[PDB]
Design an enzyme around this catalytic site. Structure first.
Site, PDB file in Angstrom:
ATOM      1  N   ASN A  73     -10.581 -65.948  14.630  1.00  0.00           N
ATOM      2  CA  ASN A  73      -9.775 -65.732  15.826  1.00  0.00           C
ATOM      3  C   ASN A  73     -10.404 -65.017  17.002  1.00  0.00           C
ATOM      4  OD1 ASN A  73      -7.826 -67.158  14.533  1.00  0.00           O
ATOM      5  ND2 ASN A  73      -6.339 -65.479  14.377  1.00  0.00           N
ATOM      6  N   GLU A 140      -9.970 -73.655  18.829  1.00  0.00           N
ATOM      7  CA  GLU A 140      -8.577 -73.839  18.442  1.00  0.00           C
ATOM      8  C   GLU A 140      -7.880 -73.624  19.775  1.00  0.00           C
ATOM      9  OE1 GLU A 140      -6.457 -70.702  16.229  1.00  0.00           O
ATOM     10  OE2 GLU A 140      -6.081 -72.240  14.705  1.00  0.00           O
ATOM     11  N   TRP A 233       3.837 -62.174   5.028  1.00  0.00           N
ATOM     12  CA  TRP A 233       2.898 -62.922   5.847  1.00  0.00           C
ATOM     13  C   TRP A 233       1.566 -62.193   5.824  1.00  0.00           C
ATOM     14  CZ3 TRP A 233       0.568 -60.897  10.336  1.00  0.00           C
ATOM     15  CH2 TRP A 233      -0.438 -61.744  10.842  1.00  0.00           C
ATOM     16  N   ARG A 264       6.094 -67.549  12.214  1.00  0.00           N
ATOM     17  CA  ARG A 264       5.336 -68.521  11.441  1.00  0.00           C
ATOM     18  C   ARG A 264       6.268 -69.548  10.815  1.00  0.00           C
ATOM     19  NH1 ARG A 264       2.238 -66.069  13.945  1.00  0.00           N
ATOM     20  NH2 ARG A 264       0.274 -65.039  13.360  1.00  0.00           N
ATOM     21  N   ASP A 360      -5.720 -76.739   7.562  1.00  0.00           N
ATOM     22  CA  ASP A 360      -5.301 -75.512   8.236  1.00  0.00           C
ATOM     23  C   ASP A 360      -4.431 -74.650   7.318  1.00  0.00           C
ATOM     24  OD1 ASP A 360      -5.061 -73.805  10.660  1.00  0.00           O
ATOM     25  OD2 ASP A 360      -2.948 -74.400  10.567  1.00  0.00           O
ATOM     26  N   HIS A 397      -4.976 -57.197  13.964  1.00  0.00           N
ATOM     27  CA  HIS A 397      -4.389 -58.467  14.379  1.00  0.00           C
ATOM     28  C   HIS A 397      -3.690 -58.350  15.734  1.00  0.00           C
ATOM     29  CE1 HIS A 397      -2.152 -62.272  13.779  1.00  0.00           C
ATOM     30  NE2 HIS A 397      -3.014 -62.530  12.811  1.00  0.00           N
ATOM     31  N   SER A 448     -10.686 -61.271  11.699  1.00  0.00           N
ATOM     32  CA  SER A 448     -11.781 -61.234  10.729  1.00  0.00           C
ATOM     33  C   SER A 448     -13.127 -60.799  11.315  1.00  0.00           C
ATOM     34  CB  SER A 448     -11.927 -62.600  10.039  1.00  0.00           C
ATOM     35  OG  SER A 448     -12.287 -63.621  10.955  1.00  0.00           O
TER      36      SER A 448
HETATM   37  C1  LIG Z   1      -1.813 -64.628   6.625  1.00  0.00           C
HETATM   38  C2  LIG Z   1      -2.911 -64.052   7.472  1.00  0.00           C
HETATM   39  C3  LIG Z   1      -3.452 -64.875   8.581  1.00  0.00           C
HETATM   40  C4  LIG Z   1      -4.584 -64.394   9.338  1.00  0.00           C
HETATM   41  N1  LIG Z   1      -5.212 -65.369  10.168  1.00  0.00           N
HETATM   42  C5  LIG Z   1      -6.436 -65.099  10.772  1.00  0.00           C
HETATM   43  C6  LIG Z   1      -7.300 -66.224  11.201  1.00  0.00           C
HETATM   44  O1  LIG Z   1      -6.968 -67.391  11.106  1.00  0.00           O
HETATM   45  N2  LIG Z   1      -8.633 -65.860  11.735  1.00  0.00           N
HETATM   46  C7  LIG Z   1      -9.152 -64.509  11.806  1.00  0.00           C
HETATM   47  O2  LIG Z   1     -10.225 -64.267  12.266  1.00  0.00           O
HETATM   48  N3  LIG Z   1      -8.409 -63.514  11.315  1.00  0.00           N
HETATM   49  C8  LIG Z   1      -7.120 -63.700  10.721  1.00  0.00           C
HETATM   50  N4  LIG Z   1      -6.496 -62.602   9.936  1.00  0.00           N
HETATM   51  C9  LIG Z   1      -6.801 -61.440  10.072  1.00  0.00           C
HETATM   52  C10 LIG Z   1      -7.850 -60.895   9.166  1.00  0.00           C
HETATM   53  O3  LIG Z   1      -7.728 -61.360   7.930  1.00  0.00           O
HETATM   54  C11 LIG Z   1      -7.978 -59.268   9.386  1.00  0.00           C
HETATM   55  O4  LIG Z   1      -8.051 -58.981  10.704  1.00  0.00           O
HETATM   56  C12 LIG Z   1      -8.962 -58.637   8.534  1.00  0.00           C
HETATM   57  O5  LIG Z   1      -9.001 -59.042   7.143  1.00  0.00           O
HETATM   58  C13 LIG Z   1      -8.662 -57.020   8.530  1.00  0.00           C
HETATM   59  O6  LIG Z   1      -9.727 -56.376   7.759  1.00  0.00           O
HETATM   60  P1  LIG Z   1      -9.369 -55.036   7.013  1.00  0.00           P
HETATM   61  O7  LIG Z   1     -10.670 -54.588   6.570  1.00  0.00           O
HETATM   62  O8  LIG Z   1      -8.761 -54.034   8.074  1.00  0.00           O
HETATM   63  O9  LIG Z   1      -8.322 -55.359   6.024  1.00  0.00           O
HETATM   64  P2  LIG Z   1      -8.634 -56.375   4.662  1.00  0.00           P
HETATM   65  O10 LIG Z   1      -9.539 -57.348   4.870  1.00  0.00           O
HETATM   66  O11 LIG Z   1      -7.323 -56.630   4.142  1.00  0.00           O
HETATM   67  O12 LIG Z   1      -9.207 -55.198   3.602  1.00  0.00           O
HETATM   68  C14 LIG Z   1      -8.691 -54.024   3.103  1.00  0.00           C
HETATM   69  C15 LIG Z   1      -9.314 -53.623   1.749  1.00  0.00           C
HETATM   70  O13 LIG Z   1      -8.913 -52.292   1.415  1.00  0.00           O
HETATM   71  C16 LIG Z   1      -8.515 -52.334  -0.013  1.00  0.00           C
HETATM   72  N5  LIG Z   1      -7.739 -51.188  -0.286  1.00  0.00           N
HETATM   73  C17 LIG Z   1      -6.429 -50.941   0.150  1.00  0.00           C
HETATM   74  N6  LIG Z   1      -5.932 -49.809  -0.213  1.00  0.00           N
HETATM   75  C18 LIG Z   1      -6.916 -49.246  -0.940  1.00  0.00           C
HETATM   76  C19 LIG Z   1      -7.075 -47.971  -1.673  1.00  0.00           C
HETATM   77  N7  LIG Z   1      -6.075 -47.146  -1.644  1.00  0.00           N
HETATM   78  N8  LIG Z   1      -8.319 -47.706  -2.401  1.00  0.00           N
HETATM   79  C20 LIG Z   1      -9.366 -48.653  -2.384  1.00  0.00           C
HETATM   80  N9  LIG Z   1      -9.314 -49.882  -1.690  1.00  0.00           N
HETATM   81  C21 LIG Z   1      -8.095 -50.144  -0.997  1.00  0.00           C
HETATM   82  C22 LIG Z   1      -7.953 -53.930  -0.044  1.00  0.00           C
HETATM   83  O14 LIG Z   1      -7.876 -54.123  -1.611  1.00  0.00           O
HETATM   84  C23 LIG Z   1      -8.932 -54.817   0.714  1.00  0.00           C
HETATM   85  O15 LIG Z   1     -10.093 -55.093  -0.128  1.00  0.00           O
HETATM   86  C24 LIG Z   1      -5.220 -62.944   9.148  1.00  0.00           C
HETATM   87  C25 LIG Z   1      -4.603 -62.109   8.033  1.00  0.00           C
HETATM   88  C26 LIG Z   1      -3.540 -62.572   7.168  1.00  0.00           C
HETATM   89  C27 LIG Z   1      -3.142 -61.645   6.057  1.00  0.00           C
END
Ligand SMILES: Cc1cc2nc3c(=O)[nH]c(=O)nc-3n(C[C@H](O)[C@H](O)[C@H](O)COP(=O)(O)OP(=O)(O)OC[C@H]3O[C@@H](n4cnc5c(N)ncnc54)[C@H](O)[C@@H]3O)c2cc1C
Ligand SMILES: Cc1cc2nc3c(=O)[nH]c(=O)nc-3n(C[C@H](O)[C@H](O)[C@H](O)COP(=O)(O)OP(=O)(O)OC[C@H]3O[C@@H](n4cnc5c(N)ncnc54)[C@H](O)[C@@H]3O)c2cc1C
Ligand code: SF4
Ligand code: SF4
Ligand code: SF4
Ligand code: SF4
Lengths: 642, 149, 642, 149
Positions: A73, A140, A233, A264, A360, A397, A448
């Site tokens: 994204n 996209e 979601w 959604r 998708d 997000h 991501s």
């Molecule tokens: C349904 C959906 C659609 C999306 N669509 C898009 C898309 O099409 N394209 C795009 O680029 N982005 C998209 N994203 C967004 C993207 O996935 C996030 O922006 C990104 O994954 C956020 O990274 P994060 O590290 O903050 O969280 P995450 O990747 O979720 O990672 C968090 C980590 O912390 C761990 N964790 C949590 N609590 C603890 C704890 N207490 N102790 C140890 N570990 C812990 C989790 O197990 C996970 O491994 C979407 C997300 C979802 C859920």
């Protein structure tokens, strides 16, 4: 609801402690955490620093990208590798307008100038990106590119693993609380956690800690309350852990009132991004009215936000909410008309885009394809219902809730540096403690690529911090012991009071995690602008929410757990309750409705740029058990005009 | 949520680790030591991410849509390879759709994290540049952004 | 959710059948059923007729009155035994106006002229009625009298047991389907059921069958979805069994679109009648506004119904809904101000009314008192929140949904007798089949006394019918065997497909009762004017509901059960699904919004007395699987003026 | 929902029937033949009617408010007699309230259904009169209602 097959009970005093000493501790092995591990491993070599990654599940598939993703994204494209090039100034303007005027532009411009490099590495590592016959990345919308991302997470996990080393990755270890410097109340010293695979208590000693736990879900009651309560979601795996431990340590939160309400596909919550932006799908109410057009007038009052293109997401949501309130549901995504118009009578072309449509879904939210299969819905023949889900709290997000973090030296204005004792990129107000991805607030639309990127930025800053400040925090053994006792308290409480009732889950002296969670969800749903009131709330409701959350927090001291799995559920509940409290307090503090479509304060229905065009930052003082709020006026950092 | 077919599951007894238990992001998959067969220990916490389904070497795991909104009969079955993944979508009415998508363009475990990158230096540590920059971004110089006057 | 401790499985062919031959069969031993048993025993002596009462639980406490009741909501008082005398004409007027103009006045006037006698018998039998020093029955409002009714059901159960004899009462026997006369397609011949305490299939052969199963609850998702899903305001024990079996037999339904939405104390759903009518409590929104005042003008459009006294309950609900939509919650019952005002500084007087207030709860809805205890709410110090619960379908309370039944020959106009092959009081359109209490539609406000009374009425009519028409129904053994197989099919399906999964509750070839119920509740909540849409719906939503109910109905053929308890649950689900379909079809048919506050047809928002001042009656033909609807214009039977 | 206290429950000693199992209107109370102690088999279907609580001769049953909205600590304990019932309400904060209400003015099992009523007759069967009418109504004659002119 949880019904363990058998007990797995341990007393704190019988659990062995394993001490791990490291320089940089990254909590969470998701996209941002893997980005931090990757980048930290590169710079750490300068001081022979040790980098440690701890994940509650398994990095190969942990977090929001477990199913994969159908697009990246955030890809600016400064050279023309995609179908559409963009500029950084245009991107910053875009994010600020989507936030209805409130975004830390120094942080946004910062991850944006770095993000494309991350994407390019992703492709180099094996991620298949959709390409045109001419070899350009397939767009996209304006900022996203389509990917064949079923293995998106496994690929990124491999990169992080190769970089930091498997011996520096601890999986199936749940972190529940941070540790602070014994001789400095505003410096981090490590963290504590426990295994969910064996009886083992972890004490991590570190000079720098990076919060990368993802956001928070299941705080609010979902639109499905049985098995489907699991169909959130956003990532059901993220329970606001970072928010809890960071706020407990005294790290300031920002824009925590900014929840995201995703519109959604109904029930399964399949993505609408490709359908809207790529397939040019139209959304209409039960009477065939295209509300983005029929409700255009209602947005004119928002200046200049209502005239922005694209229209800010909260305002798009607002148009939907008006239709819902008028009772014009079902709201339909006319996939049948979208595919027909795009195919133009070409059957082979139809088959092609038909396959693209299913990918998708199959590359990221299989449940929606499964829903279609179970309900006999063929997208080329009939439309699908759509709906806004319950609220989620995250900062990567479309929502910008998270910790108030420091920006880069070259972009952050003096106005935003005031609360940071040390000026290191992405460091919170607590020295040595960084926040990234969902955990870093006020700089959304990272997704991501941007989350992985923010992790890289914090990682380099952490190495710089350690080498320049040469931090050397000391954990407090007394506190560690008290925390070890707290960690397993739920199991000990179960054993101590289970004999009061012939039923393990109906006891007058304790609540099980699922029981406390049902309660939390009901409170938030009914008083904190949940689906029950079509995202509306007011001062009175929020105040009552705090009263009920107070009762629940007191009862958390009476939580019980029957096995390690449930012990983790117990702490995940604790994490959500405090996250919920912070969210309520933030919504209560901001006396305006700046994001109609995400939430409405019926007592302050208008957007107030005269006194509320500011970030709302708060701090929780654990020793005094007091919350303090302050307003940090927004300032435009990057050059752009409406 | 996910469910295990007793007939196909062998408890990963011929492997060094239990695949489903190992992969589940929400810690739902576990082994019933009695039967030596896996099961989802808390289905209402299942995100239906299909990780367990894809990683079960015996193809013993499938997903039965959440009862709240799913009529019986539908199914999505993946067959994940090394460079692509195949899907079979079966409708309640019997219709069957088949798809195949790429998942990786390079061999697994072939990533060289800092391939081509110069060594880090104390001087570089003080700049805004991340590993591989500015060239990995596609530009010879670090991207500039106009600050507001 | 249900997790049985152990299996209790039986195959239909392994279960012994017990044939019971009787003359009058009463299905359901609640208040109406006990009234029928009591009266039937009196007249049955004329022909030496056998009267049989079948109850799924235990008559001593079965049904809506399990906890007791704090008042008798229907006591006309034609002589002055209470603090206020009333006339029958005024009562009939009251009920018709509360129904916004639609009530079978012949039926209402009929139970009204008999109800006082029933109440007098109740007191004779031991029920303690509140009395003034002068010995007068204490009035709550205009039509109710306060009672010390903790043992209200046990007392009534004793009267019925003494009348018919314990040898004629079958308990713990769940009736799931009626049997029709083999010699006549529109005549009843008995019913089939099964024990929930042992493997035993029951075949009841009868000349007359009386439906007294109570109404239907848990059709809609409640405001609490965890353990509290059990806290339905109306009797959770009543699952629309009578509605199902009667409609399947071809008996016509009436006003099935008329659900009741109870505005009660929030969450616990404690009663508000005494607080409003007796204690003179005021209900105010979050800002202290008494909305019955501020929203009075909004009822002007409902002339002359909006001018009635008391104001129609649905209109009172409408005022509440307006407040909720405007975001003026919480809505408070100011018990603290009510008690202070009533006591007038007299401490002893306060103690007395305080005891009365708590008895009002402890005598019928203990959960509300328990809620106050858990939340530290002292009514003399702080107010309590109130809210409308999800919809319930019944015909004895404020809702008038039920079967279209015949009235007394001396009151029923020719306009209402057209659909009855035989004219016997309370008989449905199916010969020999009677409906009472919640099962009899178009004549609400019966409550405890009226339901018992209606049962007496039908019982005498049943004896008259038997002695006059002299029926001799023959059951179809072929159909009986088909029903026996269906009865235990869920258990056989569980045994047949459980091996497809290592988890009993996650199977692709069957759904468990709780799983099907969660599904039903979600469909009704989201599409049939449930709490999800603040009781709003339209043609499209209702049509989609029918589509989803169609899928669910088909899946009922794949229901599974692990023990007798769950087998009953399976059939209670089956009963609710068909009840739900009838409700949806009825709401779809009536193109108007006559009861705003109970439900709103956003596509037909106005009350239409030009085209819809009629009863909506329907009939389901099991053979053709077709629903036929008819409009029966309302005619004023009793003399009265606005 | 209701829950059984193991220390007080005796699985209903040698009596003829299990009180709680016998009285529950929703068929929730049952015995665990192994422990010889009762339990609520499906708490989310409990109406909290207190029938089981009142009928347990050992007073081994209590009610713990639904977790959805109930903070821990509150309790309502009844002591049902023959002519009255006593209640003790304990608040989460320690506050304790005591009430006592009448429940019956006559001896249990003393009801004579048609006491004083004349015998029914075939002629009477054809009227609108129920057993005991019009005497039991208290009026000078069967109540008349004015029909709309
Ligand atoms: C349904 C959906 C659609 C999306 N669509 C898009 C898309 O099409 N394209 C795009 O680029 N982005 C998209 N994203 C967004 C993207 O996935 C996030 O922006 C990104 O994954 C956020 O990274 P994060 O590290 O903050 O969280 P995450 O990747 O979720 O990672 C968090 C980590 O912390 C761990 N964790 C949590 N609590 C603890 C704890 N207490 N102790 C140890 N570990 C812990 C989790 O197990 C996970 O491994 C979407 C997300 C979802 C859920
Ligand atoms: C919370 C609440 C407050 C109320 N407040 C008042 C008040 O204050 N004063 C007043 O006068 N009235 C009040 N009523 C109303 C009153 O209780 C009813 O009007 C009355 O009980 C309806 O009688 P019934 O016979 O139709 O239903 P019930 O009394 O419920 O009886 C139905 C019977 O059928 C059984 N049954 C159901 N399905 C089957 C089956 N398939 N096979 C065998 N048996 C079956 C049930 O187990 C029960 O024994 C209230 C009701 C509730 C629930
Ligand atoms: S991965 Fe498959 S074979 Fe192995 S334990 Fe799990 S389900 Fe059984
Ligand atoms: S589908 Fe995903 S969340 Fe559910 S059990 Fe499998 S791996 Fe876990
Ligand atoms: S009635 Fe009481 S003593 Fe008897 S089984 Fe039930 S709980 Fe135990
Ligand atoms: S409180 Fe009532 S519904 Fe609950 S278990 Fe006891 S008797 Fe049954």
């Amino acid at each position: 609801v949880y019904y363990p097959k058998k007990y797995e009970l341990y007393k704190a005093d019988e659990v062995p402690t394993e001490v791990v000493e490291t320089d940089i501790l990254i909590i969470g092995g998701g996209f941002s955490g893997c980005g931090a591990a990757y980048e930290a491993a590169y710079w750490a070599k300068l001081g022979g620093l040790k980098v440690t990654l701890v994940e509650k599940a398994a990095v190969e598939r942990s977090g929001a990208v477990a199913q994969g993703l159908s697009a990246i994204n955030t890809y600016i494209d400064l050279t023309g590798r995609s179908e559409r090039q963009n500029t950084l100034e245009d991107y910053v303007r875009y994010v600020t307008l989507d936030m209805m005027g409130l975004a830390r532009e120094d942080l946004v411009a910062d991850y944006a100038r770095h993000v494309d490099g991350t994407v390019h590495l992703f492709e180099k590592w094996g991620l298949p990106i959709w390409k045109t016959p001419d070899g350009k990345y397939v767009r996209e919308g304006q900022w996203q590119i389509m990917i064949h991302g079923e293995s998106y997470k496994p690929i990124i996990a491999e990169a992080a693993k190769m970089a930091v080393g498997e011996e520096n990755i601890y999986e199936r270890v749940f972190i529940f609380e941070l540790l602070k410097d014994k001789n400095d109340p505003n410096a981090v010293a490590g963290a504590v956690g426990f295994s969910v695979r064996e009886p083992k208590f972890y004490v991590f000693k570190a000079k720098a800690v990076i919060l990368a736990t993802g956001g928070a879900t299941l705080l609010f009651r979902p639109r499905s309350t049985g098995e489907a309560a699991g169909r959130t979601w956003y990532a059901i795996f993220d329970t606001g852990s970072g928010y809890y431990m960071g706020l407990k340590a005294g790290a300031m939160l920002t824009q925590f009132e900014h929840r995201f309400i995703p519109f959604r596909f109904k029930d399964g919550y399949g993505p609408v991004g490709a359908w809207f932006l790529f397939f040019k799908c139209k959304a209409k109410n039960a009477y065939g009215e295209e509300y983005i057009k029929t409700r255009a007038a209602e947005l004119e009052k928002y200046k200049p936000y209502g005239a922005a293109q694209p229209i800010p997401t909260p305002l798009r949501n607002h148009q939907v909410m008006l239709e819902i309130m008028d009772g014009n549901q079902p709201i339909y995504m006319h996939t049948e008309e979208a595919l027909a118009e795009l195919a133009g009578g070409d059957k082979k072309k139809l088959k092609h885009i038909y396959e693209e449509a299913f990918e998708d879904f199959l590359d990221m939210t299989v449940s929606q394809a499964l829903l279609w299969a179970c309900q006999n819905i063929d997208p080329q023949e009939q439309p699908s219902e759509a709906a806004p889900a319950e609220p989620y709290i995250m900062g990567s997000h479309s929502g910008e809730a998270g910790f108030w973090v420091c920006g880069p030296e070259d972009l952050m204005p003096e106005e935003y540096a005031k609360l940071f004792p040390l000026k290191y990129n992405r460091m919170t107000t607590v020295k040595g403690l960084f926040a990234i991805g969902d955990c870093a607030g006020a700089n959304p639309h990272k997704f991501s690529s941007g989350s992985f990127t923010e992790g890289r930025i914090a990682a380099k800053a952490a190495v710089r911090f350690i080498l320049e400040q040469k931090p050397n925090p000391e954990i407090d053994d007394a506190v560690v012991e008290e925390l070890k006792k707290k960690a397993y308290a739920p199991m000990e409480r179960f054993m101590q009071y289970k004999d009061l009732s012939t039923a393990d889950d109906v006891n007058p002296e304790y609540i099980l995690p699922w029981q406390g969670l049902v309660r939390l969800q009901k409170i938030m749903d009914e008083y904190a602008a949940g689906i029950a009131t079509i995202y509306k709330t007011n001062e009175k409701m929020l105040q009552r929410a705090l009263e009920l959350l107070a009762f629940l927090k007191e009862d958390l001291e009476k939580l019980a757990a029957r096995d390690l799995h449930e012990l983790m559920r117990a702490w995940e509940l604790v994490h959500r309750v405090w996250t919920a409290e912070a969210h309520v307090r933030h919504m209560l503090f901001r006396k305006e409705t700046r994001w109609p479509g995400y939430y409405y304060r019926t007592d302050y229905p208008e957007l107030n740029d005269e006194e509320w065009k500011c970030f709302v930052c708060s701090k929780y003082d654990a020793e005094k058990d007091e919350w303090t709020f302050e307003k940090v006026p927004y300032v435009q950092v990057i050059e752009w005009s409406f | 949520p996910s469910f295990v077919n007793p007939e196909k599951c062998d408890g990963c007894k011929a492997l060094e680790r239990t695949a489903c238990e190992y992969i589940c992001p929400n810690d739902l998959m576990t082994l019933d030591k009695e039967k030596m067969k896996a099961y989802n220990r808390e289905p209402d916490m299942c995100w239906e991410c299909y990780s367990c389904v894809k990683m079960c070497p015996q193809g013993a795991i499938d997903v039965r849509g959440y009862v709240d909104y799913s009529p019986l009969g539908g199914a999505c079955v993946p067959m994940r390879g090394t460079s692509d993944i195949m899907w079979t979508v079966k409708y309640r009415n019997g219709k069957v759709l088949r798809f195949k998508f790429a998942i990786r363009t390079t061999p697994w475990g072939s990533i060289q994290p800092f391939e081509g990158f110069p060594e880090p230096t104390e001087e570089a540590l003080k700049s805004e540049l991340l590993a591989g920059e500015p060239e990995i971004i596609g530009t010879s110089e670090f991207p500039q952004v106009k600050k507001k006057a």
